[PDB]
Amino acid sequence: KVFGRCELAAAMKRHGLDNYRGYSLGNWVCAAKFESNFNTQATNRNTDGSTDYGILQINSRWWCNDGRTPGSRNLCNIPCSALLSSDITASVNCAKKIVSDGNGMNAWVAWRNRCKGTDVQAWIRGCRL
Numbered sequence: 001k002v003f004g005r006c007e008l009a010a011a012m013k014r015h016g017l018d019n020y021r022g023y024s025l026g027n028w029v030c031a032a033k034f035e036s037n038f039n040t041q042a043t044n045r046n047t048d049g050s051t052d053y054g055i056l057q058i059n060s061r062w063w064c065n066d067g068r069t070p071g072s073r074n075l076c077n078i079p080c081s082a083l084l085s086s087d088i089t090a091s092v093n094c095a096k097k098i099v100s101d102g103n104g105m106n107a108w109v110a111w112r113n114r115c116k117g118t119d120v121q122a123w124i125r126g127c128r129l
């Protein structure tokens, strides 16, 4: 599923991501934009041989199992394929664990490089939330 911007904002809010660990909804929508372009089916191979999965490009090195990331963890206790579903529940539940890990949203390099410090509220502009 390719979410609309406000459609994804509404879904993230419903699942309690808005101001989760003190990150406003616009931060999460901004991260999703630059990680996945709002595409639940987005997959990207990392140089270390791990893969990033779904709207928030959750890495198989730590968070989900894909069966092909040697020496990796599955700290969200999910198959990485569950992160590609049209229903973002699994991605959000796993993102809540990632952002609680100590470095907040800096875990998402694209958030640090493209969203951090910017006018992230622009990403929920005009949304009925």
Ligand code: NA
Residues within 6 Å of the ligand: 060, 061, 062, 063, 064, 065, 066, 069, 072, 073, 074
């Ligand atoms: Na893994």
